[PDB]
Amino acid sequence: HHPCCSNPCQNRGECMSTGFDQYKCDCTRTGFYGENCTTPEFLTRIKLLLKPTPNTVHYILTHFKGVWNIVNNIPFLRSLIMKYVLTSRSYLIDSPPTYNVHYGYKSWEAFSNLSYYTRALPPVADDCPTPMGVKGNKELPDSKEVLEKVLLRREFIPDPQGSNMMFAFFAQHFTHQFFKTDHKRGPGFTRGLGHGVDLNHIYGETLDRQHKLRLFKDGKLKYQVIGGEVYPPTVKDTQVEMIYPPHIPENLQFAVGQEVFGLVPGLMMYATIWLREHNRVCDILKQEHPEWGDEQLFQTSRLILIGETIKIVIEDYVQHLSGYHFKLKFDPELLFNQQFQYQNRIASEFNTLYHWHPLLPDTFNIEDQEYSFKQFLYNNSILLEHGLTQFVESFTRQIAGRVAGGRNVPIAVQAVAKASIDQSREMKYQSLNEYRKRFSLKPYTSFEELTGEKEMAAELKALYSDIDVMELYPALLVEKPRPDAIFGETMVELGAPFSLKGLMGNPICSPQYWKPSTFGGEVGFKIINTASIQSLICNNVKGCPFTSFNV
Amino acid sequence: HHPCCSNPCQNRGECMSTGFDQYKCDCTRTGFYGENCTTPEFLTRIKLLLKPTPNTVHYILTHFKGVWNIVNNIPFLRSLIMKYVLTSRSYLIDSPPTYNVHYGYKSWEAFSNLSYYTRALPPVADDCPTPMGVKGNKELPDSKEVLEKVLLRREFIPDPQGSNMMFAFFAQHFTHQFFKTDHKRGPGFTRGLGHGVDLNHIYGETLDRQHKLRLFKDGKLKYQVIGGEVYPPTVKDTQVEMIYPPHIPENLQFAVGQEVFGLVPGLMMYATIWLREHNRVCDILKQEHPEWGDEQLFQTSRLILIGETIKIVIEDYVQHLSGYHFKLKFDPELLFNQQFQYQNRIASEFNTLYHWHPLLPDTFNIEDQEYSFKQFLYNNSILLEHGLTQFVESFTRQIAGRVAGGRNVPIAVQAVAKASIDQSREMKYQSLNEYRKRFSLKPYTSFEELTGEKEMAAELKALYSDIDVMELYPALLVEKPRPDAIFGETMVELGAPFSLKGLMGNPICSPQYWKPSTFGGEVGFKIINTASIQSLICNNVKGCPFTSFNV
Ligand code: COH
Ligand code: COH
Ligand SMILES: *[C@@H]1O[C@H](CO)[C@@H](O[C@@H]2O[C@H](CO)[C@@H](O[C@H]3O[C@H](CO)[C@@H](O)[C@H](O)[C@@H]3O)[C@H](O)[C@H]2NC(C)=O)[C@H](O)[C@H]1NC(C)=O
Ligand SMILES: *[C@@H]1O[C@H](CO)[C@@H](O[C@@H]2O[C@H](CO)[C@@H](O)[C@H](O)[C@H]2NC(C)=O)[C@H](O)[C@H]1NC(C)=O
Ligand SMILES: *[C@@H]1O[C@H](CO)[C@@H](O[C@@H]2O[C@H](CO)[C@@H](O)[C@H](O)[C@H]2NC(C)=O)[C@H](O)[C@H]1NC(C)=O
Ligand SMILES: *[C@@H]1O[C@H](CO)[C@@H](O[C@@H]2O[C@H](CO)[C@@H](O)[C@H](O)[C@H]2NC(C)=O)[C@H](O)[C@H]1NC(C)=O
Ligand SMILES: CC/C=C\C/C=C\C/C=C\CCCCCCCC(=O)O
Ligand SMILES: CC/C=C\C/C=C\C/C=C\CCCCCCCC(=O)O
Ligand SMILES: CCCCCCCCO[C@@H]1O[C@H](CO)[C@@H](O)[C@H](O)[C@H]1O
Ligand SMILES: *[C@@H]1O[C@H](CO)[C@@H](O)[C@H](O)[C@H]1NC(C)=O
Ligand SMILES: *[C@@H]1O[C@H](CO)[C@@H](O)[C@H](O)[C@H]1NC(C)=O
């Protein structure tokens, strides 16, 4: 078996076979040396005793509301802090990217082939003696047992942070531009070849789909008017392929950039809101530039919408998820004198950790109705019946589920939850503890320490035996949450570097792009820098209902 | 007409229309302000009073051999100087990239579509009153007339810097991995989607082509053995498409990563040398790693050859061209504490300036024979007849043509020389003087100042009327050379930023890749960091003949 199977190399050191049964660790720039990269250099030892733990940092950022209130009002100070949040998080991501499901060593194939998700840790080699390497039993516990014992919802557990359905649907719509598993090829492959925030879920992944969605007048997207309301055009009108089961009537097959977005009326609500936003931006641009043509109106609006998206995601979405009293800021200039790579490759494990199915409620409650999963799925009649204003007002009020803490996956999606476990193993993911060490976190020393509780911990001990072979995905969903929080530490500490990297990595954030003329002048540039989830709804939904990401 | 037609914004200010007959310049981070970005800030005023001209710096680099001898052997000084070279040149290149032939403003399409070459200057708008904007006549002079009066060789002008045919064929083999114009789509499009030094000219641009070239044993590339010598395998054996006339003997239809390389035996010489190098690195790695299979042997050799290529290009090829007494160094670590983007997009103008037609001799002299272009073209028999040893010995001794200085384009390639002019015009290139200002050079104030001479200057004055509409490509070939140099200022000052950017921008130069484990341990790493043009031939050509890029 591969001499690296036991993952001997510590502290981001890299393992290489040097014979059939010997390895060498490459400790370059890790700040450690010795056979396994565990002897700290003097200056490292100094950093290690002065580094606060992630839990300490969390405490600080979630208390002293009064101090943060002052901090938030000193632009100089707010910038300093926001800069440090960006730099520290991004240093954890390999960029240019390295490994993928087929390459546990760096290769040109893994670097150059955009069809793969990248990998933050290399796969476990095919010939290892146990699924996690050398530890644990020959087989991992039946995934149906893991799912049933510690993942499936008994009573609905509401998110104590107050996340609503506007938030759950925003997360689903936004992340589905960059998590687009290519099932013809397997779970380690993506169809999102732009690998980030390019708004392909609005404009289409390829030029051909974009051209069928565009009106070719005024920079606009095609649309239809139903009952005086603007909605996406149909499949029949556009020839844009969409995934619909065969019983969907032609007039109900809306066409949008992402072909799975007809699956869910919460996804279509966002699709329709963003299509309106693009056309509203074209209108403002045409007023600023009566000399411009359609192609430039269209491309400039798309750049403006990419900036609006990043800005909302940082200052509304991540803000709300963080629970911080510090006010996060979208400001590309904070990086202009730092070392930072303006590029991103989507990581398989970032896709895995975003499988937030416990966020889903037991029913979808719009106005006086409570729809089951079966009535909601595929059913865009519900959208037309109630209308966008009612959808916003209903979803803003309805609470989502807690994600960490265990037993909160709705039964309606049990096959999806089981697939995440199975596919993690097909992709030969290393263990939870290897992933915690990869992200500068202490390994968990027991199931009880992971869960913070006794009963789920004891079920997992019986299922897995050894904490060091506990798997990443189920651990994210059973992990002890922060006090009154939606997530536990592992979710935050992996999720935040992948997220900030992907947001800031965008070329629009680069110094040659981040200038008013990129966006058609100061008016277009202000649209980005003042965008918000409330303004997005206010500008594009009749009556301008109030909204946010909390109930 | 477009109000930016006259190129009103200076100092890398960006021009935008603000109504039908009005523009705004965006002076963001230029160090200038005012309507056209021409009023310098105080620090800018200071930094401009202190900056030496390129010709002063070139003079210092090519004199005081005595001092440079000292500097070359003080590793700390050498590194400090090489560091400054890398950083100051790279800063001129937009990265992430911006314009292309269809987009004279930033857009997602121009960012994301890898089929385009990028553009260092936006194209002249389609509706400008003259080819170059607003200056000059309604039509540029007939390209055949410019070609015949100032470009065509009367008698062969030797390169005074002593470049040889090893150098000339190395330039052509090396640059044709990244200049691969997609003539199906147009001159502003490329088939080299890796946009740099990925060695697709050895390994194939696509995975399907790579797999047909590979042996699948020991990491190796397929090959044949003719009269005891190793050569690339055939088109028949591999089913790899190559460009060859119908008459070529089956066994001379050599198949290599790049489809056009059977065109010229000097290109097949280097293809053959590099195929041998790949398989020799396979043998070294198999010895080091008997545990490794074919796939990892193949990928790790590729990474190693990519490193060897960068190494030789900087320390042999660019060293030679530069004329400097300072010893250039390939060392990724010099950029580790600098701001630098590990990515590259090939510029259309870098392709245009690399049209080094005048390097070609009047005949190709091997051993006793002197072959004409007609006899040399598509003729791999000559390679087999003389053998690689004789190739290297003859090409090392045969001098190449001078590139600048005018009238040195061999007539056998006059059609290609005329195409460079016609296609520059189709891609709506801005003028020489706009390019010189883009790269911080003073615009030429007369045709005489451009050429350093009278007769060509007078022909060009009558052809073009205004120096501000002289064209880039033909200016590079008539420009007054540096003293006994192969190139003028404009060639070196545009060429060096594009070159060093594409060299250092490669992911293998990034801190996560630049580690001995990437290359299979210390043995593979050393192969890279001790590569030269001499060791390349010594290891792979029977008898280990002396070679160099000069004499
Ligand atoms: C972001 C939070 C979130 C939410 C709220 C959510 C809500 C819902 C929902 C009700 C509206 C339904 C019916 C489903 C059903 C599914 N989900 Co999501 N999912 C979410 C995050 C994800 C992610 C991320 C993936 C992987 C997508 C991929 O890789 O293509 C996923 C995968 C799936 C798949 C697998 C098919 C595939 O194309 O990979 C199904 C089926 N699920 N989910
Ligand atoms: C670098 C030095 C160099 C040399 C020594 C050289 C030597 C030779 C040679 C010797 C046997 C022959 C027969 C030709 C003939 C040709 N050259 Co070159 N070329 C060179 C630099 C280039 C470049 C760069 C291009 C554009 C390549 C592309 O875009 O595909 C080119 C283009 C061409 C093309 C067609 C592609 C195009 O873009 O128009 C032909 C045909 N030529 N050339
Ligand atoms: C990168 O940009 C290239 C230049 O735009 C582009 O090539 C172009 O692709 C389009 C659309 O696929 C082809 O045009 C076709 O448009 C309609 C679509 O319904 C067809 O029915 C027409 O008959 C026509 O064939 C363009 O001809 C083609 N232009 C070229 C090759 O110069 C690439 O598609 C873009 N690449 C990517 C990844 O987007
Ligand atoms: C290097 O890390 C390795 C891999 O775990 C260590 O090797 C194991 O060490 C344990 C405890 O000392 C023993 O069971 C064996 O000696 C090792 N196992 C195997 C399979 O060899 C090693 O001791 C660490 N090396 C150093 C020098 O600290
Ligand atoms: C910016 O450049 C513009 C356009 O190139 C200048 O306009 C010219 O300036 C002077 C007028 O005194 C003349 O040389 C030209 O006849 C003018 N041409 C046009 C089209 O206006 C303008 O002055 C520059 N602005 C500044 C403030 O320097
Ligand atoms: C990226 O890698 C995938 C997986 O290797 C490649 O997909 C395969 O293409 C091969 C070789 O042409 C085929 O035999 C199979 O049809 C594909 N295998 C799959 C999908 O798993 C893909 O071609 C690569 N992309 C690029 C640009 O090279
Ligand atoms: C391409 C990826 C770009 C954006 C991804 C968007 C949202 C994901 C945000 C967080 C995932 C879980 C951790 C939450 C981050 C809050 C903590 C912090 O700001 O440090
Ligand atoms: C893809 C880009 C990578 C490599 C470029 C390859 C060759 C370029 C070399 C010459 C173009 C003219 C450059 C002369 C540079 C010498 C001066 C200097 O180093 O500053
Ligand atoms: C080498 C191909 C020459 C083709 C001749 C057509 C162009 C003639 O051009 C003339 O050539 C003369 C001879 O060198 C020069 O003295 C003139 O200045 C030049 O205009
Ligand atoms: C779809 O939802 C509508 C409400 O608009 C409901 O009346 C109908 O029964 C649903 N259809 C299905 C197939 O569940
Ligand atoms: C090709 O080269 C051979 C020598 O190897 C030469 O004698 C022959 O004439 C050439 N063929 C053509 C078509 O010129």
Nearest to B487 by CA among B176, B179, B146, B159: B159
Give the DSSP H/E element, type plus range, for residue B121: none
Tell me whether residue A423 is exposed, middle or buried, using C-beta atoms within 10 angstroms of its C-beta: 0 to 12, 13 to 18, 19 or more.
Answer: buried
Residue type present at position B267: L
Under 8 Å between Cβ of B400 and B167:
yes
Under 8 Å between Cβ of A187 and A427:
yes
Test A516 with B26 for CB contact under 8 angstroms.
yes
Q: Residues 6 or more apart from B452 whose CB is under 8 A from it?
A: B480
DSSP H helical segments within A377-513, as ranges?
A: 381-386, 388-397, 414-426, 432-438, 447-451, 455-464, 472-478, 489-504
Lookup: tokens for B426: 């189709």
Count interface pairs A-B at CB distance under 8 A: 140
Check if A85 has its Cβ closer than 6 Å to any atom of ligand 1: no
Rounded distance between C-alpha atoms, residue A458 and residue A474, angstroms: 15
Please provide residue A59's backbone torsions phi and psi, each rounded to the nearest 5 degrees.
-55, -50
Is it true that A1-41 and A42-551 share their CATH fold? no
Test A198 with B112 for CB contact under 8 angstroms.
yes
| Nearest 10 degrees: Cα torsion B49, B54, B57, B58 | -170
Nearest to B487 by CA among B547, B420, B401, B429: B401
- For residue A254, list its beta bridge partners: A234
Lookup: tokens for A292: 């411009």
Please provide residue B17's backbone torsions phi and psi, each rounded to the nearest 5 degrees.
-80, 150
Rounded to a whole number of angstroms, the distance between the first and last alpha carbons of chain B is 53
% helix / strand / coil in chain B, to the nearest 5?
50, 10, 45
Under 8 Å between Cβ of B390 and B275:
no
CB count in 10 Å sphere of residue A450: 23
* Residue of chain A whose Cα is closest to the Cα of B520: A16
CA of A419 to the centre of ligand 7 (A): 23
Rounded distance between C-alpha atoms, residue A390 and residue A367, angstroms: 7
Under 8 Å between Cβ of B538 and B305:
no
The residue length of chain A stands at 551
* Residue of chain B whose Cα is closest to the Cα of A111: B507
Q: How far, in whole angstroms, is CA A285 from its chain's centroid?
A: 31
Breaks (C-N over 2.5 A) in chain B follow: none
Which residue's alpha carbon is at the smallest distance from atom 36 of ligand 2? B181
Q: To test ligand 2's pocket by mutation, which of B348, B383, B413, B414 has the most ligand atoms within 8 angstroms of CB?
A: B413
Under 8 Å between Cβ of A138 and A120:
no
Rounded distance between C-alpha atoms, residue B493 and residue B504, angstroms: 17
The residue length of chain B stands at 551
Most distant CA atoms of chain B, gap in Å: 72
Rounded distance between C-alpha atoms, residue A92 and residue A498, angstroms: 8
Please provide residue B169's backbone torsions phi and psi, each rounded to the nearest 5 degrees.
-70, -30
% helix / strand / coil in chain A, to the nearest 5?
45, 10, 45
Angle CA B202–B207–B210, to nearest 5? 35
CATH topology of domain B42-551: Myeloperoxidase, subunit C (1.10.640)
Lookup: tokens for B146: 């410019």
Handedness of CA B519, B524, B526, B530 (dihedral sign): negative
Q: How far, in whole angstroms, is CA B69 from its chain's centroid?
A: 28
Rounded distance between C-alpha atoms, residue B452 and residue B456, angstroms: 9
DSSP H helical segments within A178-262, as ranges?
A: 200-203, 207-213, 235-238
CB count in 10 Å sphere of residue B525: 19
Angle CA A257–A258–A260, to nearest 5? 145
Rounded distance between C-alpha atoms, residue B244 and residue A36, angstroms: 54
Nearest to B309 by CA among B523, B508, B79: B508
Q: Residues 6 or more apart from B72 whose CB is under 8 A from it?
A: B78, B325, B326, B327
SS3 letters across A361-385 = CCCEEECCEEECHHHHCCCCHHHHH
Under 8 Å between Cβ of A118 and A346:
yes
Rounded distance between C-alpha atoms, residue A286 and residue A274, angstroms: 18
- For residue A190, list its beta bridge partners: A181
Domain boundaries, chain B: 1-41, 42-551
Angle CA A127–A128–A133, to nearest 5? 155
Q: What three-state secondary structure class fits A181? A: strand
In this complex, which of B16, B109, B342 lies closest to A299 when CB atoms are compared?
A: B109
Rounded to a whole number of angstroms, the distance between the first and last alpha carbons of chain A is 53
B211 counts as catalytic: no
Rounded distance between C-alpha atoms, residue A335 and residue A81, angstroms: 12
From residue A267, give the alpha-carbon distance in Å to each of A174, A194, A350, A378, B90: 9, 21, 21, 10, 44
Check if A328 has its Cβ closer than 6 Å to any atom of ligand 1: no
CATH number of the A1-41 domain:
2.10.25.10
Give the DSSP H/E element, type plus range, for residue A429: none
Q: Residues 6 or more apart from A84 whose CB is under 8 A from it?
A: none
Under 8 Å between Cβ of A290 and B19:
yes
Under 8 Å between Cβ of A20 and B290:
yes
Q: Per residue in B229-251, is it b (16+ CB within 10 Å) or e — as a string?
A: bbbbbbbebbebebebeeebeeb
Under 8 Å between Cβ of B118 and B98:
yes
Q: What three-state secondary structure class fits A19? A: coil
Residue type present at position B4: C
In this complex, which of B94, B292, B521 lies closest to A512 when CB atoms are compared?
A: B94
